[PDB]
Amino acid sequence: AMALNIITVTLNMEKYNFLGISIVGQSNERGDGGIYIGSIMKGGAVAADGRIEPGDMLLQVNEINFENMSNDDAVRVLREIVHKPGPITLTVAKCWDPSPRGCFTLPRS
Amino acid sequence: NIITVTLNMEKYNFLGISIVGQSGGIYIGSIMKGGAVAADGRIEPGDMLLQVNEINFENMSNDDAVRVLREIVHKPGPITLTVAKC
């Protein structure tokens, strides 16, 4: 496994009070997959920063690991986090390939 | 059942809903205690949102639909949601 790129973005929730993203889950039979950025909407904290992009894998939010987390939990946790005031730090990977197994694996085809 | 829900938004500044996009339309994910939608009671998870204040979502991406919804909730005044019971 190697990373194409890993970035850490601190969002000022004081200047933009909502994140402005959707999340998408991928998983296969084998437990591979994760939580990924779906849409990024203009006007939100994530769009203003400009660095996170659709298809990036969410690795961590604040101090919480998102790499082995059900969709239900990912959605609930992100809301708990947005709900309370204060900064939000998102760590994401830029993925080589958008398949469940593909974020940290170079395409072979 | 297509239902029209008028929320006067006098006592609530938010709908108290989450949205789910399907690749096609936007649907109710969950309804939160303390929002206008729960106070009304008629909308359920999995209902499809068709229009808000005469604006039709059929003509926009799911994420643009959510942006417009957010903008209309932000504007003071009553909200009318048109939903398809699923």
Partner: peptide, 8 residues
């Protein structure tokens, strides 16, 4: 299916 994070 995409799950919008911000509550409306």
């Amino acid at each position: 299916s995409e799950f919008f994070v911000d509550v409306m």
